[PDB]
Structures are given as C-alpha cells and as structure tokens.
Symmetry: C3
Subunit: 121 residues, 3 copies
C-alpha cells in the first residue's frame, strides 16, 4: 500500500528530514543563508532587554523565511533525481519560490521596523 | 484556454478543496494528526482566562502546522494519480515537507513557552 | 553543475521572480485578487489609530494569503511548460493549495475579529 506508507513517512518526520535536509545542504543551502542567518539576528534582539511578544513575532517571521527556503531546496532535490530536463522545467516553480521568500522578507521588514520602534528601543 | 480555467479553479477554492481534502483524508491525514490536534490544544488555552494577543499568536502557529500538512498531503495525492515511480520520486519533496513542519513546530514551541510564561500563567 | 547553479538561482531571488511573477500574472492572478486585496484592507486599519502590534499581526496574515497564492500560481506555471496532461495532473495539488489559503483565511478571520474587538474599536 504506497498511499498508506506515504502517510507513515509523514508520521516519521524526523527520520524523513534526514535525507531531505541532506539533499538541501548539497543542492540549495538558502535555508542557512537566509533562514538561519535571520534567526541568529532575532536571537540577538531577544537576548537583549526587549518585550516577550516582540520576541515571539520575530521568531514567527524567522519561520516564514526558513520554511520557504526548505520548499526551494525541495524543488532542486527532485530535479536532481531525474535530470536536466527537470532542472529547467521547475525553474518556473523556483522563480515563484524566490518571489515567496521576497514577499515574506519585505513585509516582515515593515513589521520589524514597527516592532523595533515600539519595543526594541 | 487551460491557463484561464486554471485561475478560475483558484477562484472557486471551496469547490476545489473538496477533491483535494478528499485525497488528503484518503492518503495523508497528518492535517488531522498534527494540524487539528494542535488547534484543539490552543482552543483550550483560548477558552481559559488568557490574553487576546496570545490567543492570536497561538492560532497563527496552528495555521503553520495545518497548511504545511496540507502541502504534504498534496504531494502524495499527485503521486497516486500516476504510480510507484512517482511515489518514490517525490520522497525528496516529502522529506523536505517533513523538515518544514518540524521547523514550524520547534520554533513555535519556543514561542509557546514564552507566551505561557507571560500570559497563560 | 546544475545543482550549484540551482542554488545560484535562489541567491538571485529578485531576478528569478521576474519570470515567475510574469507567469503568475499571465496564468493565475489570485496573488492580486486575494493577496494584495487583503493587504490593502490592512493598510487602512494600520493608517487609522490602532495598536502597533495589531498592525504587525495583520500584516503576518497578509503574508500567509500572498505566499500561498504565489504557490498556486507556481503550480499552473509549470503545467503551461508542458501541456494538458499536466494541467489535469496537478489539479490535486491545486485543490490542496485552495484548501491551504482557505485555512489561512478562515483562522485569520477569527484572529481578525479578536484584534478588532481588542484594539481596532
């Protein structure tokens, strides 16, 4: 039963993420370049004397960048499984994935300036 | 015009979600296992005497788990439409999808402890 | 090296989004229909005398609608690159994508009423 085992694969998310995040590191490491880089900047603001709700709101935007870059890495991982015809095919999906994190970042930066003006100081 | 009707399909999202969420329930029900399960736990904290902003922030993390599991179900639904070659192919995309909800949950739990310490009590 | 250049494509997100958001406007403009439409409604509440945290929380739900519709446009863009067999194939993925923005909106509306009752006035 491939459909039943497909759900079992989701149930064991940690194990699954091993080969996925492996292919991510190998093919597209924007998870680290933007995802974790932004995470670390928030960690600094959170370490400093700020408000607990700002801390939460900043982490929420961190998840938006991390997750979308995981989706971008997923695109290239599957292309590698077959060949150059697919490396070109998914370029439209990857273009939209770039647009997705751009939108996440641009609007997050607006909220970031607001939060810094009201609570970071 | 397939492209024009493609947008019309998005315009009627409710109708579309019928066959999609059908395939989700059949193939991968992590939408219920993690998505709704976490939702119900927030509903309890929100029913109790807490702050309205915490209520909102918890619902926001609920949407992060629900939506990503809908994306995981989408992966297996399309594999079923063709066969075992695709059930194996998308396993990399599914691995990254597992990583996506793991990241959503792990960082959400950090915000959850913060919110519980500042407002749940 | 297609995998290395795949990451380079992500590094230049702005450039990539050109052809992606081009295909979005051509094939599926729900980014504008729901994404920006909701954004503009928040801009009005934010322009009015409200709380800075509400302003941030509303923008966060705007990003949820915008991003998911970018993912919906991505689906149809790739179908156009090959043909009608794929326009039908991805319909399950598109159905789940419709479910994704429905869930984002429905739970966001609950948070929206809460925020309006506590801060909009």
């Amino acid at each position: 039963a491939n459909n039943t085992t497909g759900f079992t694969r989701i149930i064991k998310a940690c194990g699954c993420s091993w080969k996925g995040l492996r292919a991510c590191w190998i093919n597209e490491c924007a998870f680290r370049q933007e995802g974790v880089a932004v995470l670390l900047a928030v960690v600094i603001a959170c370490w400093l004397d700020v408000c607990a709700i700002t801390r939460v709101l900043l982490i929420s935007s961190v998840m938006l960048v991390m997750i979308v870059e995981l989706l971008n890495s997923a695109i290239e991982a599957v292309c590698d499984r077959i060949g150059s015809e697919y490396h070109e095919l998914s370029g439209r999906a990857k273009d939209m994935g770039s647009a997705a994190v751009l939108i996440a970042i641009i609007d997050a930066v607006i909220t970031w300036a607001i939060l810094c003006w009201s609570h970071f100081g």
